[PDB]
Write a protein that binds this ligand. Structure first.
Ligand SMILES: Cn1c(=O)c2cc(S(O)(O)NC3(C)CC3)ccc2n(Cc2ccccc2)c1=O
Length: 505
């Protein structure tokens, strides 16, 4: 009853040399490299706050251009924020009233039910006592410190750009304390066109309704804010936007298949340590992390909070793009999934740091397609799309095959998205092969799926079929079993078709 199949996970390339970290035309470094030292909290670069208020950068809450209308007169919104947050919250309403002081237009649109219910109905007296007395004051302190922490203008990783932003974990915490307190200007109204192609950053939507899940999301987030406020994080984090111009001619790809480890046990974060961990992403990175959504992406964004900050500068992902986040830390341990997600305990991430003091953790955000009808996923353009999506996230332009760790993946785009597990598994296997990387596949309790993926991989490997040879079989399946197939389910399935087409040849 073998719990895993293929190449042993111990033989799979696990990570971690690095070229000198320096700013460049396509790389933003917001800290002092010369002073970057292990165990030492990074010093921000520049020394004095530098402001930018343009269509190309983040509009900081502390900017001198961040103003609000007054009865005449244009007051400073950052002064309002300070005056608002420097009061003693001793009841949930105190915090609601503080957020709404500098967010007037939303005083009747923003619901604070989940925030009230967590403080008054979920938390115990002593727990709530630790909230209004210790965590929250300490959160306000790191938020208000923003001009001293984030001195350099942060660029927006806009669509088409191949750019990276290396910044300290301390800088990310000051930034996320501002998102909790809903301080980022020009990211609130659903009718603006300035940030409509960007995901929600301010945490307002986390405070609405009566979902049993929001207290759990809040417990997760407060565990993070408690950690970072208690002890300043010492490491760094890199956010790369990778856009590809030239994609492979799939039908004529001579590359063979790589190695595979396939299991119905384990997780991406635990068993995929030192591997390229795949995030089953939403085109707007992080999905509904700051609202109702609570699946694969949201859970990760909750357990690894420095992922939430990508939402501040990552423009909606177009088909040829992916987001690579390196150096994020895990602050929480969890139980369950979706409607049964529970915050377990505090986790102490024991990962090593690289020459750029980044935790040896690499995550790729790759968005899958949302199939309107189930048969649409076998349509050539749509299989070519997913293959280009995965290839992008897997490809490392300018890196040697031997120095690339395995891909830790699973059922990507399968739930409310409708993806065929068996097709997606082949697309990922073909993407990884084209980008010379082995595959570590988690089937999440599905024992059957694991046997099926293993068998297909072994069948293709032995009969020695190329990426082109396999891709041509997927084009045959659409033609023979989908092109004029009216019924919602085709007569014959994909893997039986693959065994048939090859054996009979
Ligand atoms: C669809 N689906 C997943 O995609 C899944 C993915 C992960 S993970 O990507 O390893 N880890 C996380 C959520 C990134 C941090 C962990 C649990 C998962 N589960 C729950 C489950 C696991 C085992 C048996 C029964 C249910 C699930 O249903």
């Amino acid at each position: 009853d073998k719990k895993w199949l293929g190449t042993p996970i111990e033989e799979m390339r696990r990570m971690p040399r690095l070229p000198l970290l320096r700013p460049s035309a396509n790389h933003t470094v917001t800290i002092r490299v010369d002073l970057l030292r292990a165990g030492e909290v990074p010093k921000p670069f520049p020394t004095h706050y530098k402001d930018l208020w343009d269509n190309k950068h983040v509009k900081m809450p502390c900017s001198e251009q961040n103003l609000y209308p007054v009865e005449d007169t244009a007051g400073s919104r950052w002064e309002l924020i300070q005056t608002a947050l420097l009061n003693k919250f001793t009841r949930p309403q105190n915090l609601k009233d503080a957020i709404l002081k500098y967010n007037v237009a939303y005083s009747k649109k923003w619901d604070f039910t989940a925030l009230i219910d967590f403080w008054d109905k979920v938390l115990e007296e002593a727990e709530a006592q630790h909230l209004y007395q210790s965590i929250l004051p300490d959160m306000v302190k790191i938020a208000l410190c923003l001009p001293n922490i984030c001195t350099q203008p942060i660029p927006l990783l806009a669509a088409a750009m191949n750019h990276s932003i290396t910044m300290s974990q301390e800088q990310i915490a000051s930034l996320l304390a501002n998102a909790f307190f809903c301080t980022f200007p020009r990211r609130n109204a659903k009718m603006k066109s300035e940030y409509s192609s960007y995901p929600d950053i301010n945490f307002n939507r986390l405070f609405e309704g009566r979902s049993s899940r929001k207290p759990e999301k809040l417990k997760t987030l407060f565990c993070y804010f408690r950690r970072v406020t208690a002890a300043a994080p010492t490491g760094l984090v890199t956010f790369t936007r990778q856009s590809l111009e030239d994609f492979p001619e799939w039908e004529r790809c001579e590359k063979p298949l790589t190695r595979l480890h396939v299991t119905y046990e384990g997780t991406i974060e635990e068993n995929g340590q030192g591997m390229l961990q795949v995030d089953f992403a939403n085109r707007f990175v992080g999905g509904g992390v700051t609202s109702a959504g609570l699946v694969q992406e949201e859970i990760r964004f909750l357990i690894n909070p420095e992922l939430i900050i990508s939402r501040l500068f990552t423009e909606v992902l177009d088909h040829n793009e992916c987001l690579i986040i390196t150096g994020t830390e895990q602050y929480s341990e969890y139980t369950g999934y979706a409607e049964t997600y529970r915050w377990s305990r505090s986790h102490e991430d024991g990962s090593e740091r690289d020459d750029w003091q980044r935790r040896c953790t690499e995550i790729v955000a790759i968005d899958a397609l949302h199939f309107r009808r189930y048969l649409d996923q076998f349509v050539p353009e749509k299989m070519r799309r997913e293959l280009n999506k995965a290839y992008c996230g897997f490809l490392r332009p300018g890196v040697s095959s031997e120095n690339l760790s395995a891909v830790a993946t699973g059922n990507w785009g399968c739930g409310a998205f409708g993806g065929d597990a068996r097709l997606k598994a082949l697309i990922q296997i073909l993407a990884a092969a084209a980008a010379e990387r082995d595959v570590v596949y988690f089937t999440f309790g599905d024992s059957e799926l694991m046997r099926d993926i293993y068998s297909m991989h072994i069948f293709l490997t032995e009969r020695k079929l190329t990426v082109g040879d396999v891709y041509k079989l997927l084009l045959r399946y659409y033609n023979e079993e989908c092109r004029n197939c009216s019924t919602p389910g085709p007569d014959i399935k994909l893997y039986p078709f693959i065994y048939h087409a090859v054996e009979s040849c």
